[PDB]
Amino acid sequence: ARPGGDTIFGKIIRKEIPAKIIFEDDRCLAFHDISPQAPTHFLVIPKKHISQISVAEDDDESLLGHLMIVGKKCAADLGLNKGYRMVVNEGSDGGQSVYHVHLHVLGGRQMHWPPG
Amino acid sequence: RPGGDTIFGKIIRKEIPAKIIFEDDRCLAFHDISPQAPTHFLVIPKKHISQISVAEDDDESLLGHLMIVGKKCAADLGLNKGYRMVVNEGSDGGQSVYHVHLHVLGGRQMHWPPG
Numbered sequence: 001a002r003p004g005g006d007t008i009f010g011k012i013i014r015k016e017i018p019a020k021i022i023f024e025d026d027r028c029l030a031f032h033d034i035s036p037q038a039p040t041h042f043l044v045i046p047k048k049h050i051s052q053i054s055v056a057e058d059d060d061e062s063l064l065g066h067l068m069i070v071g072k073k074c075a076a077d078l079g080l081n082k083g084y085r086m087v088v089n090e091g092s093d094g095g096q097s098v099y100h101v102h103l104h105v106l107g108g109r110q111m112h113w114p115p116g
Numbered sequence: 117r118p119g120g121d122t123i124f125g126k127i128i129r130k131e132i133p134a135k136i137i138f139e140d141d142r143c144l145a146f147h148d149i150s151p152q153a154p155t156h157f158l159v160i161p162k163k164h165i166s167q168i169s170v171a172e173d174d175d176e177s178l179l180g181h182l183m184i185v186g187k188k189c190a191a192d193l194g195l196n197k198g199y200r201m202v203v204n205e206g207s208d209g210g211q212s213v214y215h216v217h218l219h220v221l222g223g224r225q226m227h228w229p230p231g
């Protein structure tokens with residue numbers, strides 16, 4: 001197991017391929033999504049490879065919460081003052097495509113209900 | 117006031133009924149009264165945080181706890197094919213109640229975009 005894991009996100013974490021990075025620290029990375037579904041759409045990912053939220057450990061609590069705090073801070077820095085939606089997809093019914101935990105943050109338009 | 121002045125505060129205080137799934141010292145999980153999937157529940161902190169935008173760095177572990185409780189409840193609700201977790205902020209996010217809440221939806225295919 002490489003730092004960052006074996007998915008495409010591991011290449012982003014290891015800087016092998018570029019991404020438009022909003023924030024980085026020793027625990028996580030936030031970057032814009034290349035297939036945006038809203039005028040602003042970014043991802044916050046842990047540097048630790050957790051494949052899916054369903055396999056997260058109890059002591060990954062802090063890390064998961066950090067993703068959300070980083071998300072909210074990045075949303076504010078990106079000017080999302082009218083609101084936004086955070087999404088985590090799990091497995092096939094959740095529409096998860098990349099098996100590395102990631103938090104979507106979408107805003108800049110009205111989001112509708114249901115959320116897919 | 118502890119747990120707040122929203123309907124979710126009333127639920128936490130047991131003043132009105134809810135379809136409670138799980139409780140601990142710091143959070144409550146209950147089925148959404150307006151479900152959008154065959155399983156649709158909420159995980160909420162007992163601490164009244166109005167919205168994710170005002171959460172503080174010291175709330176990190178509590179927020180993560182909502183996600184871990186959500187995953188554990190999803191498993192005990194039979195959701196083995198997946199699910200979607202959602203936090204709405206503000207008007208554009210479609211936030212319905214100004215008390216932080218994590219939605220967990222599954223039991224059907226969730227689609228893209230997520231609203």
Ligand SMILES: Nc1ncnc2c1ncn2[C@@H]1O[C@H](COP(=O)(O)OP(=O)(O)O)[C@@H](O)[C@H]1O
Nearest residue numbers: 008019032033034035089095096097098099228
């Ligand atoms: N190299 C990349 N840079 C930015 N976004 C990426 C890259 N590769 C994948 N993505 C995005 O990663 C996201 C993965 O989320 P998942 O929840 O796994 O799938 P989807 O949500 O597309 O059905 C998608 O929104 C996709 O565009």
